[PDB]
Coordinates of C-alpha atoms and ligand atoms in Angstrom, one line a residue:
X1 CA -6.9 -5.4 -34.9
X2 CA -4.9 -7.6 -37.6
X3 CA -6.3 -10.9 -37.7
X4 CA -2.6 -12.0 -37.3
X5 CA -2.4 -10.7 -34.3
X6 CA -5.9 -11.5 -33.0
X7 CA -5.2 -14.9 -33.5
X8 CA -1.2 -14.9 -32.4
X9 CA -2.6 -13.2 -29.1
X10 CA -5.9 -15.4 -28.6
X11 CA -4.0 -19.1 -29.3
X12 CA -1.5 -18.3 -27.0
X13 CA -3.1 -16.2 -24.0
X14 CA -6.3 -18.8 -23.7
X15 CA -4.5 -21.8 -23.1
X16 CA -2.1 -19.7 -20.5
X17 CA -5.5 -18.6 -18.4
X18 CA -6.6 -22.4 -18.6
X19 CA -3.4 -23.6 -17.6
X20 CA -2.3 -21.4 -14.8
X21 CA -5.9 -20.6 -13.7
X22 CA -6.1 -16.6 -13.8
X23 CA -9.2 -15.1 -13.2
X24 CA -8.7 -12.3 -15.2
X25 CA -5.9 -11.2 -17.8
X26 CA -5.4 -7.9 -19.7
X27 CA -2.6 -7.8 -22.4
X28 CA -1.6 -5.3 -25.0
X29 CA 0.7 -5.9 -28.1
X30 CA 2.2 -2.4 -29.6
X31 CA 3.1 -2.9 -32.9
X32 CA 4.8 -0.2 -35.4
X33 CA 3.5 2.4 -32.8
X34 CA 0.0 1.3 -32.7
X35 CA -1.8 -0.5 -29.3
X36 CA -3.9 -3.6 -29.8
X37 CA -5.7 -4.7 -26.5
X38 CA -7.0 -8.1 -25.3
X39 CA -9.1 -8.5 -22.1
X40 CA -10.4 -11.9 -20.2
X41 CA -12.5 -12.6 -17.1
X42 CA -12.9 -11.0 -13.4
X43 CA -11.1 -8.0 -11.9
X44 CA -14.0 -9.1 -8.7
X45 CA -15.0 -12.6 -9.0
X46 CA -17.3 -11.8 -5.6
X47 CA -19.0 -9.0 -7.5
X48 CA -18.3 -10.1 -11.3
X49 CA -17.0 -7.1 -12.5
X50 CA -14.7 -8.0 -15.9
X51 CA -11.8 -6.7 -16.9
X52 CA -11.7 -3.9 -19.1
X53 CA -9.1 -1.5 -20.5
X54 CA -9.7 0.6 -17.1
X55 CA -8.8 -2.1 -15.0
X56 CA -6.1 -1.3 -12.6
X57 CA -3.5 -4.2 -11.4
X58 CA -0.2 -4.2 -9.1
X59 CA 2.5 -3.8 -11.3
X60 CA 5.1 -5.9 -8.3
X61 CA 8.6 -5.6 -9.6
X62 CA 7.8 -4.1 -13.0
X63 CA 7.7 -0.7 -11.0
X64 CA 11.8 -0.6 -11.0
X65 CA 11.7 0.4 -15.0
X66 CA 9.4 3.3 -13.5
X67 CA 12.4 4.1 -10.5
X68 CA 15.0 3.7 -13.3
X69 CA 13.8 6.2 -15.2
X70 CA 13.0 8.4 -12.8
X71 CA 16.6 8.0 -11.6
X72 CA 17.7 8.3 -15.4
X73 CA 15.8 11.5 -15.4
X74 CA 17.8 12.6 -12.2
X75 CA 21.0 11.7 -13.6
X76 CA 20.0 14.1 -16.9
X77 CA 19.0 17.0 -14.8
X78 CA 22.6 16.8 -13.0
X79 CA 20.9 16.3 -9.8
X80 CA 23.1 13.0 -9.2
X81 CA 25.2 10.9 -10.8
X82 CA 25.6 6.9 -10.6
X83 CA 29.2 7.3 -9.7
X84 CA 28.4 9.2 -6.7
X85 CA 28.9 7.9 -3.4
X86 CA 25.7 6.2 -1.4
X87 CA 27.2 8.1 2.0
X88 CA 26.7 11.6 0.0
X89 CA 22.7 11.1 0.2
X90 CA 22.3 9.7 3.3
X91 CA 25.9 10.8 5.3
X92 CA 24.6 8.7 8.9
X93 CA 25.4 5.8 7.3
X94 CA 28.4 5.7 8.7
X95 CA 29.1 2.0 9.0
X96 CA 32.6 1.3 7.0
X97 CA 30.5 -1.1 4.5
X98 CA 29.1 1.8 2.8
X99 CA 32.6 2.9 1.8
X100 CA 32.8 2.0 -2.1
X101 CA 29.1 1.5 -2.4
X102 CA 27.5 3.7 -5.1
X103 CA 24.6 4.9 -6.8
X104 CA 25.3 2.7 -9.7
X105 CA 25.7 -0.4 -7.2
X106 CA 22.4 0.2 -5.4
X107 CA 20.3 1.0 -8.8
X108 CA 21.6 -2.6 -10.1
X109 CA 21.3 -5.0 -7.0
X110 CA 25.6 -4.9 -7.2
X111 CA 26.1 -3.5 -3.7
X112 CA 27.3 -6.2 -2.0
X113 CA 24.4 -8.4 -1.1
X114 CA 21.4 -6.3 -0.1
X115 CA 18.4 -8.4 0.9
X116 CA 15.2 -9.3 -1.4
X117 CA 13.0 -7.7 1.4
X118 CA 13.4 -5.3 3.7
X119 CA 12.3 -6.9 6.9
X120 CA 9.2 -6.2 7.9
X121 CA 10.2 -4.6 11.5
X122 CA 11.3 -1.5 9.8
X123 CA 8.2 1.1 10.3
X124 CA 10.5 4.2 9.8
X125 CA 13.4 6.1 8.1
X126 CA 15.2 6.0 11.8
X127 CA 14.2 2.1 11.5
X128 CA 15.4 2.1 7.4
X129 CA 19.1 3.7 8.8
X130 CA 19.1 0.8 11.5
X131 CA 18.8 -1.8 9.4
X132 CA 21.1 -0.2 6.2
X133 CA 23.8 0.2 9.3
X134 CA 23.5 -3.4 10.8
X135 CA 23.4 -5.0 7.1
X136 CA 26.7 -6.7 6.7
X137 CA 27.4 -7.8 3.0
X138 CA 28.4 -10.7 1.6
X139 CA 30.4 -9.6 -1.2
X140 CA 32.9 -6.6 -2.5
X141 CA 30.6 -4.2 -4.3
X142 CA 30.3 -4.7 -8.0
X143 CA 31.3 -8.4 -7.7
X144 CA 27.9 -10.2 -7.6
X145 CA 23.7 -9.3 -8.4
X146 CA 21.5 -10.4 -6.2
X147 CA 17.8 -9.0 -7.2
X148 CA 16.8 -6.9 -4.1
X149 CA 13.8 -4.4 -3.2
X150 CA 16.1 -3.2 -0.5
X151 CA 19.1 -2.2 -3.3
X152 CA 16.6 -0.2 -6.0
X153 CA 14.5 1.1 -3.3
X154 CA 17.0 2.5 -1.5
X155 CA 18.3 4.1 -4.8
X156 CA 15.2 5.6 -5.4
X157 CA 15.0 7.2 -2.0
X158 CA 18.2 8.4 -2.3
X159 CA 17.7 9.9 -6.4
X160 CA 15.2 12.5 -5.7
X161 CA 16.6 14.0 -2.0
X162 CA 18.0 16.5 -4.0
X163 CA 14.6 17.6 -6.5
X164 CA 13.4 18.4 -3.1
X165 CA 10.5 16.4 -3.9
X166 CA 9.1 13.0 -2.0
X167 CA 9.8 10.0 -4.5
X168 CA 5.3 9.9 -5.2
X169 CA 5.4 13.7 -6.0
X170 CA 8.7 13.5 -8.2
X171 CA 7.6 10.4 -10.3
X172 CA 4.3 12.1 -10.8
X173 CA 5.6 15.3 -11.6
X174 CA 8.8 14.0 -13.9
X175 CA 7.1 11.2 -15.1
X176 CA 3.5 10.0 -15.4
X177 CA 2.3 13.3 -15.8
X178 CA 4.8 13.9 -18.9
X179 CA 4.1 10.9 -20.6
X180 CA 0.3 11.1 -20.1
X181 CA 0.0 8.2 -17.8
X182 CA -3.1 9.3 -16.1
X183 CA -4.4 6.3 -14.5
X184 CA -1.0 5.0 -12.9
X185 CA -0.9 5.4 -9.0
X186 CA 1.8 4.8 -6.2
X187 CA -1.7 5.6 -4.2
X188 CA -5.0 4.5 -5.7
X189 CA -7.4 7.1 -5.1
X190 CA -10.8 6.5 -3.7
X191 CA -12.3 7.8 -6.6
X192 CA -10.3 4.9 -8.7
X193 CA -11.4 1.9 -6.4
X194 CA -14.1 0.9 -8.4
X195 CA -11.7 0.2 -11.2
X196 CA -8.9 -1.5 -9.5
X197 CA -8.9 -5.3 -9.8
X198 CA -8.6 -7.9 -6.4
X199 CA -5.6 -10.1 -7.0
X200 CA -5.9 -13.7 -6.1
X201 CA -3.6 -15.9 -3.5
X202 CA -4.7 -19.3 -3.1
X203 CA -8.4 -18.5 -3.8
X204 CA -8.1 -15.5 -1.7
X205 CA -9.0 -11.6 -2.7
X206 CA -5.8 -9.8 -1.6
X207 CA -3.8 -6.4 -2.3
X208 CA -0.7 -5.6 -2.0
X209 CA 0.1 -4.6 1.8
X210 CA 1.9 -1.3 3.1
X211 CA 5.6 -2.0 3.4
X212 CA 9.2 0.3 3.7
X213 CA 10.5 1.5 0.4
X214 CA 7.2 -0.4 -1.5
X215 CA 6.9 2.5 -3.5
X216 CA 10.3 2.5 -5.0
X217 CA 10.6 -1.0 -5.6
X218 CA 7.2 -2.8 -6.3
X219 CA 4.2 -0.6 -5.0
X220 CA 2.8 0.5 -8.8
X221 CA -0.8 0.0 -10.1
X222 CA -1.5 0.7 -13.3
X223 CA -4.2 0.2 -16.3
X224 CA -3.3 -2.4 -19.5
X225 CA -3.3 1.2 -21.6
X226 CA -1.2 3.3 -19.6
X227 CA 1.7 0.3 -19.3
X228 CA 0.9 0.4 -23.0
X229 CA 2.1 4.0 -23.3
X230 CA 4.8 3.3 -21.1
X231 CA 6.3 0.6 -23.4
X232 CA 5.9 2.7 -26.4
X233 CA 7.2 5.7 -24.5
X234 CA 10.3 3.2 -24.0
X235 CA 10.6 1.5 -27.3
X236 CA 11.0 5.2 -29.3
X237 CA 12.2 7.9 -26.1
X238 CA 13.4 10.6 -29.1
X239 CA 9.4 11.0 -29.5
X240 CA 9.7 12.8 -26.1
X241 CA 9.3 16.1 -25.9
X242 CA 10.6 16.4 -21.9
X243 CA 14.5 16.5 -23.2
X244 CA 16.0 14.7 -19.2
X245 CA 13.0 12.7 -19.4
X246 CA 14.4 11.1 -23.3
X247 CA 17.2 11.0 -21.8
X248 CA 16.5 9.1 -18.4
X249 CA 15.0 6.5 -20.4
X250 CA 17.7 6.1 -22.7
X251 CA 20.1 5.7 -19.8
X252 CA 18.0 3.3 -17.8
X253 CA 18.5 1.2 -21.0
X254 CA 22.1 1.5 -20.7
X255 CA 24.1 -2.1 -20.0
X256 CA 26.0 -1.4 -16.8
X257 CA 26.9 -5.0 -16.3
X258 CA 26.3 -8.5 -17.6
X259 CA 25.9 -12.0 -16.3
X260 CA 25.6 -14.8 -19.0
X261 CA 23.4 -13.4 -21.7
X262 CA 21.7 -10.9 -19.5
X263 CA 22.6 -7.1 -19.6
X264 CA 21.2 -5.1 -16.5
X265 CA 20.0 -1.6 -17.0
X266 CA 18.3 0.8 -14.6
X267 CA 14.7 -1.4 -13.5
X268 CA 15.1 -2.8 -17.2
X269 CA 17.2 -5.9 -18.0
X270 CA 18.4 -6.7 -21.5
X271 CA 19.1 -9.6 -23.8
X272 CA 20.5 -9.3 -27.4
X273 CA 18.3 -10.0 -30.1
X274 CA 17.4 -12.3 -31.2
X275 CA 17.5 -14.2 -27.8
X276 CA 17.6 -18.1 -27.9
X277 CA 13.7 -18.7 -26.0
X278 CA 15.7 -21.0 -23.5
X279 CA 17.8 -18.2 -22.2
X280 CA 15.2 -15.6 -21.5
X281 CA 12.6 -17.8 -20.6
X282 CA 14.1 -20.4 -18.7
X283 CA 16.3 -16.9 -17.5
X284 CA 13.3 -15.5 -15.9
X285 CA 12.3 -17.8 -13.0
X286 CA 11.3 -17.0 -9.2
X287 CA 10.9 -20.9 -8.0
X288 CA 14.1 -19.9 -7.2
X289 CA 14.1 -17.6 -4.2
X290 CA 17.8 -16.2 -4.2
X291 CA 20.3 -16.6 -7.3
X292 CA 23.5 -15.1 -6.7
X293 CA 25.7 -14.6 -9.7
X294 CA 28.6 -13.0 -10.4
X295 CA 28.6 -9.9 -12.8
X296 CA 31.3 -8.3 -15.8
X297 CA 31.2 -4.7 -15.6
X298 CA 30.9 -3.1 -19.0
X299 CA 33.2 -0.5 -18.6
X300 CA 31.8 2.1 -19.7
X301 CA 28.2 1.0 -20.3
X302 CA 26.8 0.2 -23.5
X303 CA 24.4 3.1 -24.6
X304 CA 20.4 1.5 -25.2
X305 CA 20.9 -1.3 -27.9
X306 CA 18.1 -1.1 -30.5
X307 CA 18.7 -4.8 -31.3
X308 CA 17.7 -6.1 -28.1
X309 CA 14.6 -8.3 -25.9
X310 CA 14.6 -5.7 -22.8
X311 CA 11.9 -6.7 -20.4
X312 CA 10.9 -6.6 -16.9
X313 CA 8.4 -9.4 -14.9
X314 CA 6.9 -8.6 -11.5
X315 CA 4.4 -10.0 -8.8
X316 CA 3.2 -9.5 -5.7
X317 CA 0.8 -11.6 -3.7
X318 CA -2.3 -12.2 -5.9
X319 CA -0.8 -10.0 -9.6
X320 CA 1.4 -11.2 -12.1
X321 CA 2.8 -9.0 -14.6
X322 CA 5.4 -8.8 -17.9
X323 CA 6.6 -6.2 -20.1
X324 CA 8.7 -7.0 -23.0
X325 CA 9.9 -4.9 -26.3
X326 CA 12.3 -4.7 -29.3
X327 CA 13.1 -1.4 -30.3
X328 CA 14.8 -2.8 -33.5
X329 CA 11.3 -3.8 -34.4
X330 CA 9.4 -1.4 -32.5
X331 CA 7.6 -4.3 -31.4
X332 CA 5.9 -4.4 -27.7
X333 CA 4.2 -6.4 -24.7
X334 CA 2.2 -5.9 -21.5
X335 CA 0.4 -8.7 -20.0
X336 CA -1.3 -8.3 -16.6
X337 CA -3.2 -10.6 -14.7
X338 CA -4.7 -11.1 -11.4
X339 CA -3.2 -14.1 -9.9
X340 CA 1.0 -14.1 -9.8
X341 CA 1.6 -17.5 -11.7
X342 CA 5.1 -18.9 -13.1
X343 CA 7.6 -16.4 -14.9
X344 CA 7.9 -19.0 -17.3
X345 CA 5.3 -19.4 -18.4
X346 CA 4.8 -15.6 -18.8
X347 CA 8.2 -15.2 -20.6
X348 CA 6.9 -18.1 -23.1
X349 CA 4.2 -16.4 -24.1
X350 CA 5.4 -13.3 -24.6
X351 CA 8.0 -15.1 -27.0
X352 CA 5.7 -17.0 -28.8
X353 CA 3.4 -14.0 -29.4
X354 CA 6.5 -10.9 -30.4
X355 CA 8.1 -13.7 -32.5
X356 CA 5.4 -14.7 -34.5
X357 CA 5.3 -10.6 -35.7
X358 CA 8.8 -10.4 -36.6
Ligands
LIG401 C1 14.3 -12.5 -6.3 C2 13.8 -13.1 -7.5 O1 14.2 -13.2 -8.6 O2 12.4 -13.5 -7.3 C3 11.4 -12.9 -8.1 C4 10.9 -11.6 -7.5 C5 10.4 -10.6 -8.1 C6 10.1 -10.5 -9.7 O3 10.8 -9.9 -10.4 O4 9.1 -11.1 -10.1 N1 10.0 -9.3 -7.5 C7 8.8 -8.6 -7.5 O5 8.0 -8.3 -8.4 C8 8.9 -8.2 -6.1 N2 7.9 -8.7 -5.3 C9 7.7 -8.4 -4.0 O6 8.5 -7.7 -3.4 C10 6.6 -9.1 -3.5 C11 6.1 -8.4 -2.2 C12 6.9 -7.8 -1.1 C13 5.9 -7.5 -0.1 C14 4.7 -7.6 -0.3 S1 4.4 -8.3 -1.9 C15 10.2 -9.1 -6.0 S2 10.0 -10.6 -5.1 C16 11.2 -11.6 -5.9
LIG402 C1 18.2 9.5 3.3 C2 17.0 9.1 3.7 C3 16.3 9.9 4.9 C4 16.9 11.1 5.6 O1 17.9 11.7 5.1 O2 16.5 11.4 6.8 N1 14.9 9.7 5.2 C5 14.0 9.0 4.3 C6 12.6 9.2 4.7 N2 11.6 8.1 4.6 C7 10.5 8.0 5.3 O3 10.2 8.8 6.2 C8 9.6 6.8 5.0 C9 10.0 5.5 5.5 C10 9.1 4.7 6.3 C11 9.8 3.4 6.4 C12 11.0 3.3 5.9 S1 11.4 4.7 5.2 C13 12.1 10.4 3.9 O4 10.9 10.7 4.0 O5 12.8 11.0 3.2 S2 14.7 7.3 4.1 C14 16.2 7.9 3.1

């Protein structure tokens, strides 16, 4: 543990807890292939159990990078393609908006306007179609990105029909188990309980609650050293042995299509580097709770850009998470904690810490 980086980590991640008020933090900084892990306070405040390098948090939104691999993978077996039609995995949705909407549009919120959430009501696939059917966009696809759980979910459903296997049993299958990540759940076992943190919502103990397509879009929950794994698995993806698997990772890296300085991948979104702070971290910011903007196609996509910041941030009720690397300098971050707090602030951080290595 370089006293660089001890330092770098500690003068930056204290003052974060004390300002934002998390009750318990894990991060871990990769650097040149190597893992260097930082825990603070409670993972159970009630029963003061600390966080540790088992600690299990919700992952939110930082689950898409897992569905846009697994749909990279998909894509490498030949089992789909981004370019097919929505309509050929899921033919009863016959409504005439679903003409011209694609893979590709779904995987990278382009679609037309799908919602952030899919509305509560829906309890079942036969509810799912209902709603996919009465949806009426706003937009021509591949006009506009609107971030939505309802547009990657629905791509994830859709990506493993034809594997045969249910979206759990393909991503453990094609990609935990590959990659070694051992203590990453869709379900948390009982056995695991003892080890997964309480996140906190106004004081509150909470967990993430059962929801349609929560799987595929933000239902994750994972240890500080298997997201650890998982960045260096995605910062050097020739290092994989599982040849669609290097290859699903490279193309969920791909830039697809770009608004401003952002580049969106599969899950992952993009920025060159090096990125002006201002755009990434004043870029990543939820106090807004719809931003509309209009997107370039990059025609074809760019192939994975070692020169860039790709990252991902996520929440859910009482979690806050951030990944961030730089395959150019094979340079990594994962910060977890336990209470969802302002993507600014995380996206600071992060920059202050990976730009003081290089
Ligand atoms: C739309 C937007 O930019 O807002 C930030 C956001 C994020 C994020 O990237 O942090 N997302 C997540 O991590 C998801 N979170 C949830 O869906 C929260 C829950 C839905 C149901 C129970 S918790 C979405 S919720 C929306
Ligand atoms: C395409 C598609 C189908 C289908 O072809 O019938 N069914 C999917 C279904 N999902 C569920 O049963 C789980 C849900 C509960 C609430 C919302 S979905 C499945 O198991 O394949 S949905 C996509």
């Amino acid at each position: 543990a370089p006293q660089q980086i001890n330092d770098i980590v500690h003068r930056t991640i204290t003052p974060l807890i004390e300002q934002q008020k998390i009750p318990g933090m894990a991060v871990a900084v990769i650097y040149q292939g190597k893992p260097y892990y930082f825990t603070w306070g409670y993972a159970d405040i009630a029963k003061k159990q600390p966080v540790t390098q088992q600690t299990l948090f919700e992952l939110g939104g930082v689950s898409k990078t897992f569905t846009g691999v697994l749909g990279g993978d998909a894509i490498a077996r030949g089992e789909i393609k981004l370019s097919d039609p929505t309509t050929k995995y899921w033919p009863e949705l016959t409504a005439k908006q679903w003409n011209g909407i694609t893979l590709l549009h779904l995987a990278t919120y382009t679609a037309g306007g799908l919602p952030l959430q899919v509305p509560d009501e829906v309890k079942s696939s036969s509810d799912l179609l209902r709603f996919y059917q009465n949806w009426q966009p706003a937009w021509a696809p591949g006009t506009q990105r609107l971030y939505a759980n309802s547009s990657i979910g629905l791509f994830g459903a859709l990506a493993v029909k034809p594997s045969g296997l249910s979206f759990e049993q393909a991503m453990q299958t094609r990609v935990f188990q590959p990659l070694k990540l051992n203590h990453t759940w869709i379900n948390v076992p009982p056995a695991e309980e003892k080890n997964y943190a309480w996140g906190y919502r106004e004081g509150k103990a909470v967990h993430v609650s059962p929801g349609a397509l929560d799987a595929e879009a933000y239902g994750v929950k994972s240890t500080i050293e298997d997201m650890a794994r998982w960045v260096q698995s995605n910062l050097k993806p020739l290092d994989i042995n599982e040849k669609t698997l290097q290859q699903g990772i490279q193309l969920a890296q791909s830039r697809y299509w770009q608004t401003g300085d952002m580049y969106q991948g599969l899950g992952w979104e993009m920025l060159d580097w090096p990125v002006n702070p201002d755009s990434i971290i004043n870029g990543s910011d939820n106090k807004i709770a719809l931003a509309a903007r209009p997107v370039k196609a990059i025609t074809p996509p760019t192939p994975a850009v070692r020169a860039s910041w790709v990252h991902k941030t996520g929440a859910t009720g009482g979690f806050g998470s951030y990944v961030a690397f730089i395959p150019e300098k094979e340079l990594g971050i994962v910060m977890l904690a336990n209470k969802n707090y302002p993507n600014p602030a995380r996206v600071d951080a992060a920059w202050q810490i990976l730009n003081a290595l290089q």
